[PDB]
């Protein structure tokens, strides 16, 4: 019943997560993404059958090519949360633990909602950041949708080349907003340029450039 | 030409006849409306359908 | 057309909107005066005759 | 109308008009038809009055945007809107519908058209097509070229499938090719039943070369050349299809001067089809 | 019952010259009357003429 | 429209008075539960009371209008389903004349009250210029023709042509018509063409034109040249 | 639903549970008047409502000239002279089922062959 | 087909019981007294004043030269009589109100011991509330409670 | 719908059943309130069968209501799953009974553990309006449409391939997007504002 269905939703979302994490350039194998629902249920569901999220939380490491292009990029930690509404104390734990392991970024998935205090404490560890996603929001990866053309984040060197070649100021680029689902998805930050390849019905391949607000 | 005229005439008349039958049916509550469409909606919809078909 | 008849017969026509006057009725009247019953008429070009 | 008893849904009552204008209308018909006409005059006045006030907004918003020499389409502030006008850089005046031959057709008929294999007996050219076809037969250097070419076309079909989902084979593109061929044929009196003097290395290297002389963005660097390619991508895919070796020799029977002059013109008109910077 | 129709013509009254001149002439004659009264106050309170 | 006219209105008092004498119960005695079926009675939106026999009442009134006792302009209505009888002596209503059809006859079915005798009695007047000058006022006092507003137009039923649609029962050229099946016609239209205004009246055969070409003609006909006045 | 009124207060009676006898009464809060209930029923909403369809039938309805006439015979008196009209309730989903009204016995009988 | 105007030429070429008397009282009595109907809203049908007990009573409960606005005699007199009457024992209380529309035509027929009658014209007509039945006067306090 | 199930009409009907907003008022013919002090025994002679079955301290007031069987059909429902819904709505404060599908008259009765009526009649509204029986909110009148779809053949030319597609009135994109059994990739709405919100700027 409801238990089973909830398991299903949680699984699909979990798939989405790995997908995004690979897209950011962290190493996960195709099969590791493609692990079927039955295997996942056995791996993280208890003998009663209820799933265990605290077992699901896991580390992501950068792919070699990624280290090559973005040397600064560090490893990532992913937590889920079992609490339906996330407590500030749990948030504190996540903050501390990440600072402990010295990851460059962190990701926290919540079930329903989080106390405003916990949200306020999120920007407390520069340069490290905390991306916060809702479980129910991640159920379906958006990028697989037809209307969403492929995105690519860029290296500053590549960027300075872009601006120089078109003779542009950053302001003059078409702008994209941080709250954008895609922006969240790739975990963009301000002044970071993305490339978009949209398939055109006139040119047939049309590049484009945008810059987070 | 006349033979065409009478042919048009009947071609309309039968259309009216169909409409009349739809009327009798729905008056007798024997008509079942298309889902999402109210009964009288489905009625008008049909009647107009027949009519434009006739004119064409 | 109706005018063309009124012209010939010397009786003004009744154009009143809703009546029993019918095109065929006119056509017959006109034919009686010897013109083509639909009002078409043979014309010659002015330049070349 | 007062002339009908209550709850009369017959189409005579609710306004069906049976008589044609030639026969005239009964009065309760006429009145209805006047109601319809009035609706037609009213809405027409509204649409006109409103549509103009849209025309003004669309103008005032878009009035400042022009196409700079760099071919970026960018408004007053210098803000980049499009990195290449219309994404292919082509003036809407010069563009025509054209048939994409690669996108449509069955697997088999497609291969039957574009595939040329000298080693296998199925798809080999008839030698009388071109003067040297006999000695050409079986030669490996050429068969390899044709292999690369054919693979190119196939992978292009894989592409166009991904671009156009429904696979509509007709799209606006510059430079009507069909008319160029026809003009050339009639021009030089291309004579069927006689062998061509075209070599295959002549054909393939002719096309692959001509592709390089189609230019929109003339900048020299990685980024620009990336755009230049992504700009001419589709049009190229059309071109290869129309100039495919089989299609050239079997159908058009072009001679040397014919095929040359065609390559020349295709590029010549092409460059005319690029937008003129300074355009508003 | 249906929502009442605002455009039912039997519920619209037309106003020709008569009703118009009635309205306007009313407010004129009020203004007139009132002015005569003011004049009476001025002459009686001031005892002139 | 040509025959349309605007009501100049009259005084309600004589009507309101007249009602009570014929048995209208004054409002203040009304006990809704005890007299459930009585038709309540409006005059110019003012509700003065009720009446228990609207049928006969409404007959009395209509008879008075047709005698010309009440000014014909007054428009009375009886809504059967609503249990209301409305009256308007008010000014500013619009009304058009019609023939009054009557079932009451020596012979069979219903017929218009106007008959040839009246007609010749009119054209005697017209062609003349014998006595008493039988004219529109006469036609209205004798109850042949009656004025009807849009309100009273609710409760009646109208026939387009007298001799087409009155009697109970085809070349291909003529237009197709409806039937006479309705036996209740209370009123018959004088002539349908009169639904046209002045501008349209000049259009020949406007039935055969698409409507907007009638409109454009209605406007353009106003600016044409032509002799405007003899003087 | 069919609520009564007080005596000499005339006001509507609000239902009062009797906890002593565990039975229902009717109180008038303006006075001491209370009387017994006649049914356990108190409130009925009736979302789907078929009443009002036949509304507006009047003793004089047979005199209405604007109403059409029909030749169908009455099931009771078998008089073929009758007047018909559609459901008086005005709503989108209101069916077009006719209501035939005889001019002899005044009886109301529908045209619906599905449900009667 | 055409319009016929030759109608000048056409019209010229064609043309046990019991009988009890009634009387109008000497007006002196009328001069002394005005007569007024009584009506109750009770719904309690009986309501004879005998039932109403007793003791019965029935009783009603510097500028410079400037402008006055004009008014009628009958209306002014009626308006000046705005203290309505009332009746009690020493408690049941009825409060009346001028009907105002029914003066109209009302003729009184008094049944006297002999079958003959006397007839007096009706002055006014009043409608008596039975007032203060449940006897809660909640006034300003009630409005304040309403402000909840 | 997903490509595998695109041809099936009945799977489609399942999804329509899984989205279109369903309210208790939609299926409710009428409701009525009764005074029945004894919790177990009911004065009503008809319902005594229900008393006999569905049984084998609480409010003296009864709330009772009747459903359209046609509504139970057009919108597929089960008297049980309904009573499930209400039970898991109000939890234990309101006892619940419901009649069988076999019953020619669909009946539902409920009671509760100082002017009780207004509180009960209040709860009646929460029942009709505030209970979403099943499906996604804001959506109405989901229409099955057979749309032809151009799809490559195994032999490579295109083939017109009819498939069942659900048009929809009202828009909530996120949830509908998440519902299992559909194809999240091709989902579409005609209001771009939401496309912007959910799927971003591009
Ligand atoms: Zn009371
Ligand atoms: Zn009968």
From Swiss-Prot, chain A:
It is found in: Nucleus. It comes from the Eukaryota. The keyword Transcription applies. The keyword Transcription applies. One of its GO terms (molecular function) is DNA-directed RNA polymerase activity. GO terms for biological process: nucleolar large rRNA transcription by RNA polymerase I; ribosome biogenesis; RNA-templated transcription; termination of RNA polymerase I transcription; termination of RNA polymerase III transcription; transcription by RNA polymerase I; transcription by RNA polymerase II; transcription by RNA polymerase III. Disulfide bonds: none annotated. One of its GO terms (cellular component) is nucleus. Keywords: DNA-binding, DNA-directed RNA polymerase, Nucleus, Ribosome biogenesis, Transcription. Belongs to the archaeal Rpo5/eukaryotic RPB5 RNA polymerase subunit family. DNA-dependent RNA polymerases catalyze the transcription of DNA into RNA using the four ribonucleoside triphosphates as substrates. Common component of RNA polymerases I, II and III which synthesize ribosomal RNA precursors, mRNA precursors and many functional non-coding RNAs, and small RNAs, such as 5S rRNA and tRNAs, respectively. Pol II is the central component of the basal RNA polymerase II transcription machinery. RNA polymerase complexes are composed of mobile elements that move relative to each other. HAMAP family: RNApol_Rpo5_RPB5 (MF_00025). This is DNA-directed RNA polymerases I, II, and III subunit RPABC1. It comes from Saccharomyces cerevisiae (strain ATCC 204508 / S288c) (Baker's yeast). The gene is RPB5.
Curated annotation (Swiss-Prot), chain D:
Residues 27-39 are annotated as: Bridging helix. It is found in: Nucleus. The tandem 7 residues repeats in the C-terminal domain (CTD) can be highly phosphorylated. The phosphorylation activates Pol II. Phosphorylation occurs mainly at residues 'Ser-2' and 'Ser-5' of the heptapeptide repeat. The phosphorylated form of Pol II appears to carry, on average, one phosphate per repeat. The phosphorylation state is believed to result from the balanced action of site-specific CTD kinases and phosphatases, and a 'CTD code' that specifies the position of Pol II within the transcription cycle has been proposed. The C-terminal domain (CTD) serves as a platform for assembly of factors that regulate transcription initiation, elongation, termination and mRNA processing. Component of the RNA polymerase II (Pol II) complex consisting of 12 subunits. Interacts with DEF1; the interaction is direct and serves to bridge RPB1 to the Elongin complex in a DNA-damaged dependent manner. Interacts with the Elongin subunit ELA1. Interacts with the Elongin subunit ELC1. Interacts with ASK10. Interacts with ESS1. Interacts with RTT103. Interacts with SHE2. Belongs to the RNA polymerase beta' chain family. This is DNA-directed RNA polymerase II subunit RPB1. It comes from Saccharomyces cerevisiae (strain ATCC 204508 / S288c) (Baker's yeast). The gene is RPO21.
UniProtKB/Swiss-Prot annotation, chain E:
It is found in: Nucleus. DNA-dependent RNA polymerase catalyzes the transcription of DNA into RNA using the four ribonucleoside triphosphates as substrates. Second largest component of RNA polymerases II which synthesizes mRNA precursors and many functional non-coding RNAs. Proposed to contribute to the polymerase catalytic activity and forms the polymerase active center together with the largest subunit. Pol II is the central component of the basal RNA polymerase II transcription machinery. Component of the RNA polymerase II (Pol II) complex consisting of 12 subunits. Belongs to the RNA polymerase beta chain family. The binding of ribonucleoside triphosphate to the RNA polymerase II transcribing complex probably involves a two-step mechanism. The initial binding seems to occur at the entry (E) site and involves a magnesium ion coordinated by three conserved aspartate residues of the two largest RNA Pol II subunits. Present with 18700 molecules/cell in log phase SD medium. This is DNA-directed RNA polymerase II subunit RPB2. It comes from Saccharomyces cerevisiae (strain ATCC 204508 / S288c).
Swiss-Prot record, chain G:
One of its GO terms (molecular function) is zinc ion binding. Keywords: DNA damage, DNA repair, DNA-directed RNA polymerase, Metal-binding, Nucleus, Phosphoprotein, Transcription, Zinc, Zinc-finger. A zinc finger (TFIIS-type) spans 70-110. A zinc finger (C4-type) spans 6-31. Zn(2+) 1 binds at residues 6, 9, 28, 31. GO terms for cellular component: nucleolus; nucleus; RNA polymerase II, core complex. The modification Phosphoserine is found at residue 39. Its main location: nucleus. It comes from the Eukaryota. Zn(2+) 2 binds at residues 74, 77, 102, 105. It is found in: Nucleus, Nucleolus. Gene3D superfamilies: 2.20.25.10. InterPro entries: DNA-dir_RNA_pol-M_15_CS (IPR019761), Rpa12/Rpb9/Rpc10/TFS (IPR012164), Zn_ribbon_RPB9 (IPR001529), Zn_ribbon_RPB9_C (IPR034012), Znf_TFIIS (IPR001222). GO terms for biological process: maintenance of transcriptional fidelity during transcription elongation by RNA polymerase II; RNA-templated transcription; transcription by RNA polymerase II; transcription elongation by RNA polymerase II; transcription initiation at RNA polymerase II promoter; transcription-coupled nucleotide-excision repair. Component of the RNA polymerase II (Pol II) complex consisting of 12 subunits. Belongs to the archaeal RpoM/eukaryotic RPA12/RPB9/RPC11 RNA polymerase family. Present with 2440 molecules/cell in log phase SD medium. This is DNA-directed RNA polymerase II subunit RPB9. It comes from Saccharomyces cerevisiae (strain ATCC 204508 / S288c) (Baker's yeast). The gene is RPB9.
């Amino acid at each position: 019943q409801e238990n089973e269905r909830n398991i299903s939703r949680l699984w699909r979302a979990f798939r989405t997560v790995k997908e995004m994490v690979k897209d950011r350039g962290y190493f996960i194998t195709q099969e590791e993404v493609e692990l079927p629902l039955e295997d996942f249920k056995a791996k993280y569901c208890d003998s009663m059958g209820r799933p265990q999220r605290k077992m699901m939380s896991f580390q992501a490491n950068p792919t070699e090519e990624s280290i090559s292009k973005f040397p600064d990029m560090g490893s990532l930690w992913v937590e889920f949360c079992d609490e339906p509404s996330v407590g500030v104390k749990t948030m504190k734990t996540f903050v501390i633990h990440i600072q402990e392991k010295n990851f460059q970024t962190g990701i926290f998935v919540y079930q329903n909602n989080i106390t405003p205090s916990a949200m306020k404490l999120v920007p407390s560890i520069p340069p490290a950041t905390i991306e916060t996603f809702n479980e129910a929001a991640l159920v379906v990866n958006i990028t697989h949708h037809e209307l969403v053309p492929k995105h690519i984040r860029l290296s500053s060197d590549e960027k300075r080349e872009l601006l120089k070649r078109y003779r542009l100021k950053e302001s003059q680029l078409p702008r994209i907003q941080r709250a954008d689902p895609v922006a969240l998805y790739l975990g963009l930050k301000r002044g970071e340029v993305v490339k978009i390849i949209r398939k055109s019905e006139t040119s047939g391949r049309y590049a484009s450039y945008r810059i987070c607000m | 030409d006349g033979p065409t005229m009478r042919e048009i005439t009947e071609t309309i008349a039968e259309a009216k006849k169909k409409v009349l039958d739809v009327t009798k049916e729905a008056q007798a509550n024997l008509l079942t409306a298309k889902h999402g469409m109210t009964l009288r909606e489905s009625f008008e919809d049909n009647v107009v359908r027949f009519l434009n078909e006739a004119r064409d | 057309l109706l005018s063309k008849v009124a012209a010939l017969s010397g009786n003004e026509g009744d154009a009143s909107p809703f009546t029993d006057i019918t095109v065929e009725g006119i056509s017959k009247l006109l034919r009686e005066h010897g013109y083509q019953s639909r009002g078409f008429e043979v014309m010659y070009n002015g330049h070349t005759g | 109308l007062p002339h009908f008893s209550k709850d009369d849904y017959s189409p005579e009552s609710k306004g069906f008009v049976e008589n044609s204008y030639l026969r005239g209308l009964t009065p309760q018909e006429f009145f209805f038809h006047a109601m319809g006409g009035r609706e037609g005059l009213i809405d027409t006045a509204v649409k006109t009055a409103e549509t103009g006030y849209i025309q003004r907004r669309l103008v005032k918003a878009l009035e400042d945007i022009m196409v700079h020499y760099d071919n970026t389409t960018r408004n007053s502030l210098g803000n980049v809107i499009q990195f290449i006008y219309g994404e292919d850089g082509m003036d809407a005046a010069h563009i025509e519908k054209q048939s994409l031959d690669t996108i449509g057709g069955s697997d088999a008929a497609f291969e039957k058209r574009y595939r040329v294999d000298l080693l296998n007996t199925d798809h080999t050219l008839d030698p009388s097509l071109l003067e040297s076809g006999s000695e050409i037969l079986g030669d490996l250097k050429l068969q390899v070229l044709l292999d690369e070419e054919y693979k190119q076309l196939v992978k292009d079909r894989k592409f166009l499938r991904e671009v156009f989902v429904d696979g509509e084979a007709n799209w606006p593109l510059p430079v009507n090719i069909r008319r160029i061929i026809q003009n050339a044929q009639q021009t030089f009196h291309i004579d069927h039943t006689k062998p061509s003097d075209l070599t295959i290395k002549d054909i393939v290297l002719g096309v692959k070369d001509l592709q390089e002389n189609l230019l929109v963005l003339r900048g020299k660097n990685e980024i620009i050349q990336n755009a230049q390619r992504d700009a001419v991508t589709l049009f190229c895919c059309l071109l290869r299809s129309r100039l495919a070796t089989r299609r050239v020799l079997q159908e058009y029977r072009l001679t040397k001067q014919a095929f040359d002059w065609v390559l020349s013109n295709i590029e010549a008109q092409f460059l005319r089809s690029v937008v003129h910077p300074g355009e508003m | 019952k249906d929502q009442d129709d605002r455009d039912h013509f039997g519920k619209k009254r037309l106003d020709l010259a008569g009703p118009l001149l009635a309205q306007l002439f009313k407010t004129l004659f009020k203004k007139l009357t009132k002015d005569i009264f003011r004049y009476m106050q001025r002459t009686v309170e001031e005892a002139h003429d | 429209s040509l025959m349309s006219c605007i009501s100049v209105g009259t005084d309600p008092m004589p009507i309101i008075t007249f009602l009570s004498e014929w048995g209208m119960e004054p409002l203040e005695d009304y006990v809704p539960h005890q007299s459930p079926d009585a038709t309540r009675v409006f005059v110019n939106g003012v509700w003065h009371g009720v009446h228990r026999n609207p049928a006969r009442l409404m007959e009395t009134l209509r008879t008075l209008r047709r005698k010309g006792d009440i000014n014909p302009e007054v428009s009375m209505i009886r809504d059967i389903r609503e249990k209301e009888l409305k009256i308007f002596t008010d000014a500013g209503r619009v009304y058009r004349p019609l023939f009054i059809v009557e079932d009451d006859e020596s012979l069979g079915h219903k017929e218009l009250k106007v008959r040839k005798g009246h007609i010749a009695k009119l054209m005697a007047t017209e062609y003349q210029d014998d006595v008493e000058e039988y004219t529109w006022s006469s036609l209205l006092n004798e109850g042949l023709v009656e004025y009807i507003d849009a309100e009273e137009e609710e409760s009646i039923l109208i026939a387009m042509q007298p001799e087409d649609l009155e009697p109970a029962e085809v070349d291909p050229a003529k237009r197709i018509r409806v039937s006479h099946h309705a036996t209740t016609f209370t009123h018959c239209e004088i002539h349908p063409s009169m639904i046209l205004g002045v501008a349209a009246s000049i259009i020949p055969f406007p039935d055969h034109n698409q409507s907007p070409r009638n409109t454009y003609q209605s406007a353009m006909g106003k600016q044409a040249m032509g002799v405007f006045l003899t003087n | 639903t069919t609520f009564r009124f007080c005596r000499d207060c005339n006001n509507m009676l609000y239902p009062r549970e009797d906890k002593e006898n565990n039975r229902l009464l009717f109180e008038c809060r303006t006075c001491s008047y209370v009387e017994e209930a006649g049914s356990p029923l108190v409130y009925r909403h009736e979302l789907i409502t078929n009443i009002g369809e036949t509304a507006g039938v009047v003793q004089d309805i047979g005199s209405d000239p604007t109403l059409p006439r029909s030749d169908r015979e009455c099931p009771k008196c078998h008089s073929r002279e009758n007047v018909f009209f559609q459901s008086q309730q005005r709503r989108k989903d209101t069916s077009m089922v006719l209501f035939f009204v005889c001019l002899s016995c005044s009886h109301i009988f529908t045209s619906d062959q599905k449900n009667k | 087909f055409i319009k016929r105007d030759r109608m000048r030429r056409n019209f010229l070429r064609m043309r046990e019981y019991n009988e009890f008397p009634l009387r109008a009282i000497p007006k002196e009595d009328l001069e002394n007294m005005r007569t007024h109907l009584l009506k109750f809203q009770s719904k309690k049908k009986i309501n004879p004043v005998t039932d109403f007990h007793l003791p019965v009573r029935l009783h009603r409960k510097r500028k410079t030269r400037q402008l006055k606005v004009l008014d009628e005699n009958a209306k002014k007199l009626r308006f000046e009589e705005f203290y309505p009457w009332v009746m009690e024992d020493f408690y049941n209380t009825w409060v009346g109100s001028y009907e105002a529309g029914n003066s109209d035509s009302y003729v009184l027929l008094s049944v006297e011991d002999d079958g003959s009658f006397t007839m007096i014209p009706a002055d006014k007509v009043y409608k008596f509330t039975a007032r203060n039945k449940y006897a809660t006067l909640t006034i300003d306090e009630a409005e304040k409670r309403m402000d909840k | 719908l997903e490509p595998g199930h695109a041809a099936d009409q009945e799977q489609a009907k399942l999804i329509r059943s899984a989205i279109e907003h369903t309210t208790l008022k939609s299926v409710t013919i009428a409701s009525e309130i009764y005074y029945d002090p004894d919790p177990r025994s009911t004065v009503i002679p008809e319902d005594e069968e229900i008393i006999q079955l569905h049984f084998s301290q609480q409010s003296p007031w009864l709330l009772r209501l009747e459903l359209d069987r046609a509504a139970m059909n057009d919108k597929d429902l089960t008297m049980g799953q309904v009573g499930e819904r209400i039970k898991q709505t109000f939890k234990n404060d309101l006892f619940v009974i419901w009649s069988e599908d076999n019953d020619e008259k669909l009946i539902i009765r409920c009671r509760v553990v100082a002017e009780e009526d207004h509180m009960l009649k209040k709860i009646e509204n929460t029942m009709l309006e505030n209970i979403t029986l099943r499906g996604v909110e804001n959506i109405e009148r989901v229409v099955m449409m057979k749309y032809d779809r151009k799809v490559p053949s195994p032999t490579g030319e295109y083939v017109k391939e009819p498939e069942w597609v659900l048009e929809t009135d009202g828009v909530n994109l996120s949830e509908v997007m998440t519902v299992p059994g559909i194809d999240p990739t091709r989902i579409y709405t005609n209001s771009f504002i939401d496309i912007m919100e959910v799927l971003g700027i591009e």
